[PDB]
Structures are given as C-alpha cells and as structure tokens.
C-alpha cells in the first residue's frame, strides 16, 4: 500500500452530512451514507460514507481506523468499533478513503453505528441491499462446498483501476457557536488560526471576511441576527449533494474508487 494509494486521499477531509434516520430523528451525521452498491454476487457491498478510512485525523496511515468530521474537528475511532447491519449484522472487510467493503445479507435498508464518548451515532438509509447467488441454485448463504463457478465480486484490493470520483473545493460551512454575545453586542471569535467570513445584516450590511482572532460587532444586539461562516478551504472534499457548493472553479482532482467489482471463482 504505502502512500501511493493514499496520495490523493491525504488531501481530503471527512464531512458531516444529513441523515434521515440517525438514532433519534433526522440530523447531520458524521457517518452519513452516500451510496450502497450491491451488484456483486456473494453478499459483498461497497458503501460510500462521509467519514474516511485507512488514515488518521492527522493525515497519516493507520491500519484500521475511521476518521470522522465532528463539528469541524476530525476525530478517530478503530474500525472494529463501527457496526454495520441491513437486516442482520454485517461484517466489515476493509475501508479505503470514502469507501467501505463489507459483507452483508439482503435487507431493505442499511444502518451504521458507533459510540465514541458517551452518545451513539447512527445513520440508517433506505438503500436496498441484494444478495445475488451464483449459478442455478438459489441459495441465501454461500455453501461450505460444491463446484467453483466464475463470478463477479467486490475485490479486497484498493489498487488504482480506471474508476474515479471527483474531489472539489469545500463550501463554507456555517457555525453559530462562534457568534457569542458580549453585553448587548455580538462577537465572533473564529477557531484558533482560522478565518471566518462574517455575513451580517444589522443596521448597515457587514461582510467581514478577514477576521482571525476576535471581532466585536457592536451594531448588533442579538446573536440570531447574522451569521459567521467558517472558512477553511485547505482540504478538498467529495462532490456531495448534501454540502453547499463553493463559488468559482471548484474541481481539484480525482479520487480512485477502491474495491471495484472484479472477476473470480
């Protein structure tokens, strides 16, 4: 593996995306599931998830690790702490970049869970998972013995084949926790060493992109009046439909899709 496979995935960040069923209600999950592909034969599925796999929060390879964005902070968990199930528990074969190779039974949905500190993070999406038998005997669980037949399965290799997905410039993500309230005056304190575009509509429109340490906007009385978008735009993100789009030329490269469907017996 080395860093040849992760050369383009070390320029990317996990993102927080909307999940329709997340433990309680619909929220913005760190493990929102983008797509589930189950066109292989022996119950192997390839998930695309907002979180990232194979490398740690710092950006260095760690063997079996899921790093997820949590309110702007990339955090880590071992891959054995993550649970997957469609109608019965799945088994995670591996994970590379945004993608996860797992072995799942058939189900009408798929659910991914993990508990980090005290709360349980879950994302359940209504993507049908299909189990496709090989040959002319319609089994549901692969047999212990028989005869070998050719089949297509999602391979356990993350090598660079011809398939690619785009990496784009992340859009500015709004953070209302930055805007605090001193005595009858809003104050924006961006994260340490990071800019924050303050877009504000009190008496007199305010567009204060370049704030780095603190800034008090005494014209405003209440926090809800106006917003402080968090500008990072150093790590590139997948072109997800559950994220805002950054203006201008946005495409920045190509990410190869691992675990592609391949011939075997």
């Amino acid at each position: 593996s080395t860093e040849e496979l992760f050369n383009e995935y070390k320029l990317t960040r996990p993102y927080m995306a909307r999940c329709i069923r997340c433990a309680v209600g619909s929220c913005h999950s760190p493990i929102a599931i983008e797509a589930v592909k189950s066109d292989g034969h022996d119950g192997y599925v390839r998930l695309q998830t907002s979180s990232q796999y194979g490398l740690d929060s710092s950006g260095n390879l760690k063997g079996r690790t899921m790093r997820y964005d949590m309110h702007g902070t990339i955090k880590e968990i071992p891959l054995h702490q993550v649970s997957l199930y469609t109608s019965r528990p799945c088994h995670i074969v591996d994970g590379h970049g945004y993608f996860l190779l797992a072995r799942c039974p058939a189900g009408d949905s798929i659910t991914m869970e993990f508990k980090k500190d005290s709360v349980r993070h879950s994302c359940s999406v209504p993507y049908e998972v299909k189990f496709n038998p090989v040959g002319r005997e319609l089994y549901t669980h692969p047999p212990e013995h028989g005869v070998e037949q050719a089949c297509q399965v999602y391979a356990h290799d993350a090598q660079n084949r011809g398939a690619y997905v785009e990496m784009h410039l992340p859009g500015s993500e709004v953070d209302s926790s930055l805007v605090s309230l001193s005595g009858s005056s809003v104050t924006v304190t961006p994260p340490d060493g990071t800019s924050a575009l303050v877009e504000c509509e009190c008496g007199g429109t305010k567009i204060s992109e370049t704030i780095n340490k603190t800034k008090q906007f005494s014209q405003c009385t209440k926090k809800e009046q106006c917003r402080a978008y968090r500008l990072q735009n150093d790590k590139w993100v997948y072109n997800s439909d559950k994220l805002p789009k950054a203006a201008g030329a946005t495409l920045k490269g190509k990410l190869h899709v691992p675990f592609l469907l391949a011939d075997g017996k």
Epitope: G183, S184, S185, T187, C202, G203, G204, T205, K206, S208, T210, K213, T214, K215, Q216, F217, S218, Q219, C220, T221
Partner: antibody, heavy 122, light 107 residues
Framework: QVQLVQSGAEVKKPGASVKVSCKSS????????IHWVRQAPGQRLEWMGW????????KYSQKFQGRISVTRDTSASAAYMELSSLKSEDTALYYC???????????????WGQGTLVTVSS | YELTQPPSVSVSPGQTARITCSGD??????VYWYQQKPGQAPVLVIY???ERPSGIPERFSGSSSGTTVTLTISGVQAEDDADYYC???????????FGTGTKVTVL
C-alpha cells in the same frame, strides 16, 4: 456625517468634581459604546472607560475605581461623565471616541470630539 | 499589562520608517494604529490590524508577526509627523490599552 460635541474648557479647583457632557449623533445610535479618553499635554493617551449609550452599561479602568462615574440620558443623547476629587495631575484634555465606519467594536473609532481641557487656575 | 513601544524614531524624508509595538496578548488581538496631529484630536490611520481606512494615503501599511506588530510608512513626507499609537485590549478582553507613542522625526 456624525457629530460629537462637548462642553467648553473650564477650570476647577482640585478636590471638587468635574462634569463633562458629550452629545453624539449621526449613526445607528441604538448600540454604540462611547469611550472617554484622557491625554496629558505631550503624554500618552489614557483610556478611562466606556459607556454603552443605548443600554446604559458602563465599564471603567482598573485604576479608576469610585473616583470615576459616567452616565447618560436618553432625551439629550449625551454622556454625562463625572470625575470627583480633581488633582493637579488631572490637568489634561478629554476626548470622546466613537466610530463613523460600519464595523464597530474594539479599536475602530473614527471620529473624535474636540475635547475639554481641565487645569488649575493661575 | 502594557504595550511597549519605542519613544521616538528619526527617518529622513523619502525613506520608509517602522513603528514597532509589542504585547503579551497581542497574537490574539487586533492592533489599531492611531495618528494624532498636535492641537486637535487623533485620526485613525490603520484598523483591522492590516489595512487602512478609505482616504488614508497608500504609503501606510501594517503587519503582525508573533507578539510584535509593525507599521511601515513608505516615503515619509513632512506631514507624517504626529503621535503614533498602537491600541489593543487587555488579555481578558475587557480593558482598552493605548501605546506609549512614537515621535517620528522627518527632516
């Protein structure tokens, strides 16, 4: 434009209390803080405190306790700074600080007043 | 808590000049450079720690490195002589502190 008008220069014997008014207008005066700053002739500017004119909240310097007392009224839209127990060293020029521009807050204070001069009779 | 600043500097006309200000809580605070002409009230020359207001001559510039901030004047003329103060706040973000002031000398 924005105008800040203070009272004329006057002389008080040390030990009394000096009253300086500061009328202000020209912007969204609902929430703007007015700073009182004292400057000795040819010396450093010294920030004494600020007053939130719209709300009425006040803040004073660390070494300005009790001797300083600022206040305002809604009708006249003017600060009413009071400084009791004048001394010889109190001879200085006093300025009001507020911002004309449209960002507000710390540091940004564009237009100043003409100031009031306080001294001791010769 | 106090923002140290040199007493005065001397730079010949048509030559850039530096004014340096320092503080303990400076890297997490914004410097406001104020110029004061003797006889009347000061006028803001630099705000937001990096960029001048509208109408200020373009020769003024400012930058911050670590715990220091520098104000640079490119090609000083005779009308640039005045009190130059660095303004910031206390480490608790509650007390406003002005600089000592630099007497720039232009010939």
């Amino acid at each position: 434009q924005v105008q800040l008008v203070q009272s004329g220069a006057e002389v008080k014997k040390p030990g009394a209390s000096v009253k300086v008014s500061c009328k202000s207008s020209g912007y969204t005066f609902t929430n703007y803080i007015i700073h009182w700053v004292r400057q000795a002739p040819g010396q450093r500017l010294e920030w004494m405190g600020w007053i939130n004119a719209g709300n009425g909240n006040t803040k004073y310097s660390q070494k300005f306790q009790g001797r300083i007392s600022v206040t305002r009224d809604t009708s006249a839209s003017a600060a009413y700074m009071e400084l009791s127990s004048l001394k010889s060293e109190d001879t200085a020029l006093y300025y009001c600080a507020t911002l004309q521009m449209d960002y507000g807050g710390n540091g940004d204070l564009d237009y100043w007043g003409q100031g009031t001069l306080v001294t001791v009779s010769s | 808590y106090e923002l140290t600043q040199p007493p005065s500097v001397s730079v010949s006309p048509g030559q850039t000049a530096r004014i340096t200000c320092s503080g303990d809580a400076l890297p997490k605070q914004y410097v406001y450079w104020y110029q004061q002409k003797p006889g009347q009230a000061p006028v803001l020359v630099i705000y937001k720690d990096s960029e001048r207001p509208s109408g200020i001559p373009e020769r003024f510039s400012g930058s911050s490195s670590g715990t220091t901030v520098t104000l640079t004047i490119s090609g000083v003329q005779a009308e640039d002589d005045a009190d130059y103060y660095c303004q910031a706040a206390d480490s608790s973000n509650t007390e406003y502190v002005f600089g000592t002031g630099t007497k720039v000398t232009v010939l």
